[PDB]
Amino acid sequence: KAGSLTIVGTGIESIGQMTLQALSYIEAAAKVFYCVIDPATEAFILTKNKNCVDLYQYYDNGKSRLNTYTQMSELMVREVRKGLDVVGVFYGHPGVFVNPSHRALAIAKSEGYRARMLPGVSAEDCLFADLCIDPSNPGCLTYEASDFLIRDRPVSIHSHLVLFQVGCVGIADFNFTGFDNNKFGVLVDRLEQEYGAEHPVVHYIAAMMPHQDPVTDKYTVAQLREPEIAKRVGGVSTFYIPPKARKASNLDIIRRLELLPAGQVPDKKARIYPANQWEPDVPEVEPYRPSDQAAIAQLADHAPPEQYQPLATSKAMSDVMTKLALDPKALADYKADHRAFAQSVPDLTPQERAALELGDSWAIRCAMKNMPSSVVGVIGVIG
Amino acid sequence: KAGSLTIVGTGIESIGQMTLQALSYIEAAAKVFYCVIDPATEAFILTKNKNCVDLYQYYDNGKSRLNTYTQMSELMVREVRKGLDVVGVFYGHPGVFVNPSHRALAIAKSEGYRARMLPGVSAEDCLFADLCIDPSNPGCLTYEASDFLIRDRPVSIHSHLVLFQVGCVGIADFNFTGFDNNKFGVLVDRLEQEYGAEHPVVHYIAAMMPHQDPVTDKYTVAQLREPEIAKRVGGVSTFYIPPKARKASNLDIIRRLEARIYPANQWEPDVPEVEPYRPSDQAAIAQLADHAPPEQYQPLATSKAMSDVMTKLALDPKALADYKADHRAFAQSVPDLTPQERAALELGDSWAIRCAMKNMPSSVIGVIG
Numbered sequence: 247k248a249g250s251l252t253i254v255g256t257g258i259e260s261i262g263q264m265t266l267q268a269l270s271y272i273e274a275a276a277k278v279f280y281c282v283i284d285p286a287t288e289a290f291i292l293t294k295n296k297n298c299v300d301l302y303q304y305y306d307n308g309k310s311r312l313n314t315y316t317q318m319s320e321l322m323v324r325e326v327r328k329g330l331d332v333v334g335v336f337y338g339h340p341g342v343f344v345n346p347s348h349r350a351l352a353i354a355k356s357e358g359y360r361a362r363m364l365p366g367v368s369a370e371d372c373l374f375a376d377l378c379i380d381p382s383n384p385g386c387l388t389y390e391a392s393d394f395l396i397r398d399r400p401v402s403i404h405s406h407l408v409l410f411q412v413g414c415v416g417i418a419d420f421n422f423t424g425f426d427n428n429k430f431g432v433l434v435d436r437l438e439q440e441y442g443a444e445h446p447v448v449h450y451i452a453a454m455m456p457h458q459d460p461v462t463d464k465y466t467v468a469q470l471r472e473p474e475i476a477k478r479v480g481g482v483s484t485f486y487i488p489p490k491a492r493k494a495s496n497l498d499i500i501r502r503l504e505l506l507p508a509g510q511v512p513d514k515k516a517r518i519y520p521a522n523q524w525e526p527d528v529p530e531v532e533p534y535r536p537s538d539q540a541a542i543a544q545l546a547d548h549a550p551p552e553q554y555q556p557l558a559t560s561k562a563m564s565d566v567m568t569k570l571a572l573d574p575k576a577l578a579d580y581k582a583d584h585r586a587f588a589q590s591v592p593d594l595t596p597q598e599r600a601a602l603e604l605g606d607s608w609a610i611r612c613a614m615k616n617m618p619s620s621v622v623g624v625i626g627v628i629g
Numbered sequence: 630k631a632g633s634l635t636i637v638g639t640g641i642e643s644i645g646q647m648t649l650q651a652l653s654y655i656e657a658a659a660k661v662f663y664c665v666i667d668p669a670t671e672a673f674i675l676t677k678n679k680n681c682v683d684l685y686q687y688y689d690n691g692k693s694r695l696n697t698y699t700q701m702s703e704l705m706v707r708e709v710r711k712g713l714d715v716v717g718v719f720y721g722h723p724g725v726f727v728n729p730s731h732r733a734l735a736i737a738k739s740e741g742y743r744a745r746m747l748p749g750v751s752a753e754d755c756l757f758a759d760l761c762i763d764p765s766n767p768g769c770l771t772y773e774a775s776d777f778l779i780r781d782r783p784v785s786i787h788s789h790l791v792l793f794q795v796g797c798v799g800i801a802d803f804n805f806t807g808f809d810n811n812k813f814g815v816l817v818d819r820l821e822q823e824y825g826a827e828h829p830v831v832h833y834i835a836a837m838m839p840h841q842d843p844v845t846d847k848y849t850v851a852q853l854r855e856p857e858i859a860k861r862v863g864g865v866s867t868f869y870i871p872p873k874a875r876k877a878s879n880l881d882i883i884r885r886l887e888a889r890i891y892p893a894n895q896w897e898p899d900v901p902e903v904e905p906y907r908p909s910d911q912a913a914i915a916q917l918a919d920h921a922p923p924e925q926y927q928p929l930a931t932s933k934a935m936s937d938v939m940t941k942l943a944l945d946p947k948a949l950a951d952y953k954a955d956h957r958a959f960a961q962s963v964p965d966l967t968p969q970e971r972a973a974l975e976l977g978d979s980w981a982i983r984c985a986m987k988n989m990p991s992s993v994i995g996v997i998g
């Protein structure tokens with residue numbers, strides 16, 4: 247069947263946080279539907295495709311968001327049924343707290359059209375970067391604020407907590423001026439029950455324009471009841487709640503994992519630098535210790551290991567691999583006939599020519615780097 | 630004070646998943662430090678800046694990663710101390726399950742230099758897109774697999790669970806050939822204990838090359854004890870465990886405040902099919918017949934010169950620096966803006982620039998969730 251739907255994101259900050267593939271698919275699209283919240287990004291989109299319709303006009307005062315979301319999705323699928331290659335655009339990540347994207351893709355799939363979502367940079371990604379925290383340490387809980395209340399979602403006082411849509415608690419509608427967030431007190435009551443009146447809450451707004459600074463204002467739970475503070479929390483506000491304390495290691499698991507043998511007890515409180523700047527009364531960890539200093543001393547005599555594989559490729563091969571990532575029409579051709587496409591690319595080496603015809607990951611990477619005398623695998627664990 | 634450190638990401642799929650701002654900062658850098666795991670992306674970066682060093686060479690067989698990570702961070706901050714503007718590059722999101730970026734920035738921050746991280750597209754972002762799930766519904770738990778076991782982190786059977794680094798449970802070092810993931814069974818035991826033997830677990834590997842398909846294989850917890858299946862789990866493997874059931878509403882809270890949504894989670898066990906066009910949907914679709922923009926709706930109405938300059942600030946890191954360094958001189962230096970546009974750039978306030986670019990009727994909200 248002719249016709250496809252691809253949904254892409256623009257990221258949070260104006261223009262700069264759009265990915266290269268999102269841009270290339272927008273330019274190649276036959277018609278574009280977008281929902282963005284900054285004018286420079288909107289104007290930028292209109293420079294890349296002449297046949298765009300702004301989905302934001304389907305919100306309205308006192309109109310259920312469900313009705314808006316249903317309308318948005320059908321407009322996209324209508325152009326798919328006419329056999330056209332359609333691109334939908336939502337700011338941030340288009341599948342993160344976005345109802346209409348999943349709806350439209352699922353309909354297109356069930357009806358038999360090609361359908362794919364390309365990921366983007368979400369508001370939580372911005373949060374990790376600007377607050378300088380990692381979801382790995384000590385885990386991350388992510389909830390919708392109203393759902394968090396209505397279905398009593400468990401807190402974990404030892405992990406990160408991220409809450410979206412704190413500016414429209416219990417509110418199912420839209421209003422152009424703003425929300426009367428008069429049920430905000432119900433969230434605050436729950437956070438006090440779970441965390442205590444003096445536990446920190448960080449009010450986070452990622453910068454939308456390139457020259458702006460983010461807001462990273464630290465409050466207590468109790469401070470959130472004061473009227474002048476509550477009204478600063480709006481439609482682009484997210485909360486970050488840091489852990490209350492550190493969870494103890496399970497002795498039986500350390501033994502089963504063989505990190506310690508039969509009779510040994512782990513070094514409690516061994517903390518990895520750096521410490522969470524937001525956790526209350528978290529102590530200072532020293533960036534340089536004897537163990538750190540000895541690792542640094544080896545930097546003097548360090549040379550590349552034997553089995554380290556430096557990149558060794560060609561202009562033709564780099565160019566074609568770049569082209570596949572940035573040229574959707576070239577990618578479709580290669581996927582149509584791996585061999586035929588590879589035969590038309592000039593100046594590849596024989597090993598390059600065989601790797602491209604196969605297209606397998608193992609063959610091409612061996613083709614593009616130098617092999618130390620010893621099939622080659624993939625390991626990127628920096629966490 | 631002179632010297633800065635900017636850390637950026639490349640996303641997961643080669644090249645295409647890099648952000649525009651990541652590219653411009655790489656090109657502008659005095660020195661570039663990169664850590665990527667695909668060859669096309671490495672080659673692409675090396676064309677865009679001519680002073681790069683590959684950090685990957687500080688791993689080694691049998692070497693603790695903590696030693697490598699301290700080395701990676703020290704290499705960068707030493708050049709910052711010389712007063713240089715340096716950018717570090719890590720694949721995916723440069724702050725998601727990556728240790729040395731925070732360390733290097735924290736050292737730089739302690740010594741008084743400007744230090745910033747630019748976000749990228751993580752493997753979890755790819756998971757949501759390829760598995761067609763939304764973190765909003767019904768919430769999402771994300772853990773490091775070894776931490777999950779050692780600290781006995783709580784599960785929630787009604788929310789999404791995502792586990793990173795399942796291919797090296799309990800392994801603190803590195804090897805070029807591969808991990809012998811022989812403690813994987815302790816993790817499988819925990820999953821059986823929490824969800825039961827027949828609950829689904831989807832093994833996910835996002836495509837790294839643009840022509841590749843993702844791995845999206847659905848297995849029961851019990852099949853993960855077969856040898857031939859366990860060896861499939863490697864250094865780029867992530868697990869998604871879907872919810873077992875739907876949690877009841879709090880009857881107290883619903884009234885204190887003033888049936889499933891299509892579509893259903895395809896991966897949940899024993900969850901019924903939903904109708905996409907219920908009658909309430911069809912009435913909203915009926916509203917298609919005659920619709921116009923609302924009265925307070927603000928259509929975009931800007932100029933080429935204005936759109937161009939705001940774009941330049943997003944795509945030219947030095948121009949941004951010049952603007953931030955001196956609002957007054959830059960705004961007046963730009964030709965062809967109207968009187969309210971140049972004044973709006975001199976101000977820099979969010980409200981002013983927006984008024985200059987949008988038609989306001991006679992008189993920031995983006996909730997699609």
Ligand SMILES: Nc1ncnc2c1ncn2[C@@H]1O[C@H](CSCC[C@H](N)C(=O)O)[C@@H](O)[C@H]1O
Nearest residue numbers: 338339343368369410411451452483484998
């Ligand atoms: N600039 C910003 N800074 C912090 N949070 C933001 C934000 N913009 C939107 N959000 C959050 O996202 C919610 C809207 S739902 C849209 C989210 C978007 N798809 C994304 O990828 O992030 C808001 O209620 C708010 O909680």
Ligand SMILES: Nc1ncnc2c1ncn2[C@@H]1O[C@H](CSCC[C@H](N)C(=O)O)[C@@H](O)[C@H]1O
Nearest residue numbers: 629721722726751752793794834835866867
């Ligand atoms: N292609 C892929 N598909 C699924 N998970 C992946 C992946 N590549 C890396 N990962 C996950 O990331 C871990 C490495 S730690 C690096 C994570 C990276 N910074 C990011 O933003 O995603 C791996 O153990 C694996 O769980």
